[PDB]
Homo-oligomer: A and B are copies of this chain.
Amino acid sequence: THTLADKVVLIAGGAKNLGGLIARDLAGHGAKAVAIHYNSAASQAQAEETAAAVRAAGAEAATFQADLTTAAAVEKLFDDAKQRFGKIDIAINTVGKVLKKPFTEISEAEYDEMFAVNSKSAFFFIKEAGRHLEDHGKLVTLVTSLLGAFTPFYAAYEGSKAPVEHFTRAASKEYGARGISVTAVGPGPMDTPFFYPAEGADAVAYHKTAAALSPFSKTGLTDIEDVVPFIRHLVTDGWWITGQTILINGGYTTK
């Protein structure tokens, strides 16, 4: 079946911003339960409000804290969510971190955290989804539209999201025998608290006018409410899309 009925969703980064809206959207469109992962203690209140909204929208909900930069923490998240809800059908990973800096200034500490958050956590999320998802399940990871760009300053960000496209290719081939669809989604720069800290005033002005459809979103950036319906499609009637990394950005970059 290609609806949300009886489906259990796990969302890494599901407490706020894009993931918190996915949680509300999939619940409201009929999902059975949403396992809501969050990382920082400052995100807990949003995680609990997201859980309450999921319940009001008709689904069960539970929250799970973890730092997902270790393989064991990812395994434990899947184990704990499956223990709570009995199965996992749809696994969506929004975990990420941005850095914008000249290549010659990027420290080892910055490299290490960028790759642990954007590459390693995504690898083990894909691994553990392969070990835990029900047959015919869904696996989606968030990347960046900068994978289609030719631009300075994002070496550690663009470079640490790049593995996900290739993880998605391999997992699509390896998990397809069980009916699982595996995709990666790259929004344009989005109007969320994730975007602004890395971007000076000139850069923000550029990003806000760089998409063909910029005049028609709220700020000129990608709005999360225009990303969630595509994720909903991929995990329902868009199941035949697999092994692809797709850019949803208002006409910002292409590939």
Using CB atoms and an 8 Å cutoff, list the residues of chain A in contact with chain B.
70-72, 102-104, 106-108, 111-112, 115, 119-120, 123-124, 126-127, 130-131, 147, 149-156, 158-160, 162-167, 169-175, 243
Q: Which residues of B contact A166 (CB under 8 A)?
A: 147, 154-155, 158-159, 162
> Given A71-B111, A150-B173, does the pair A155, B130 have CB atoms closer than 8 Å?
no
A119 touches B115 (CB 8 A): yes
What is the bound-complex CA distance between A120 and B150, given in angstroms? 21
Using Cβ atoms and an 8 Å threshold, which residues of chain B touch A103? 126-127, 130, 167, 170-171, 174-175
Min CB distance A48 to B, Å, is 31
Known: A103-B174, A126-B103, A127-B104. A159 touches B163 (CB 8 A): yes
A152 CA to B178 CA, complexed, in Å: 14
Q: Can you give 30 A-B contacts (C-beta < 8 A)?
A: A70-B108, A71-B108, A103-B126, A103-B167, A103-B171, A103-B174, A103-B175, A104-B130, A104-B174, A106-B127, A111-B120, A112-B120, A115-B115, A115-B120, A119-B119, A119-B163, A123-B159, A150-B169, A150-B172, A151-B169, A152-B173, A153-B170, A155-B166, A155-B171, A158-B170, A159-B163, A159-B167, A162-B162, A162-B166, A163-B163
Which chain B residues border A107 with CB–CB below 8 Å? 71
Copies of this chain, tallied across the complex: 2
Chain A at the B interface: SS class:
helix
Which single member of B111, B112, B151, B169 contacts A158 (CB below 8 Å)?
B169
* A165 cross-chain contacts in B, Cβ below 8 A: 162
Docked pose: A175 CA to B167 CA in angstroms: 29
Query: Would A154 and B170 be within 8 Å (CB), given that A71-B111, A111-B71, A160-B163 are in contact?
Result: yes
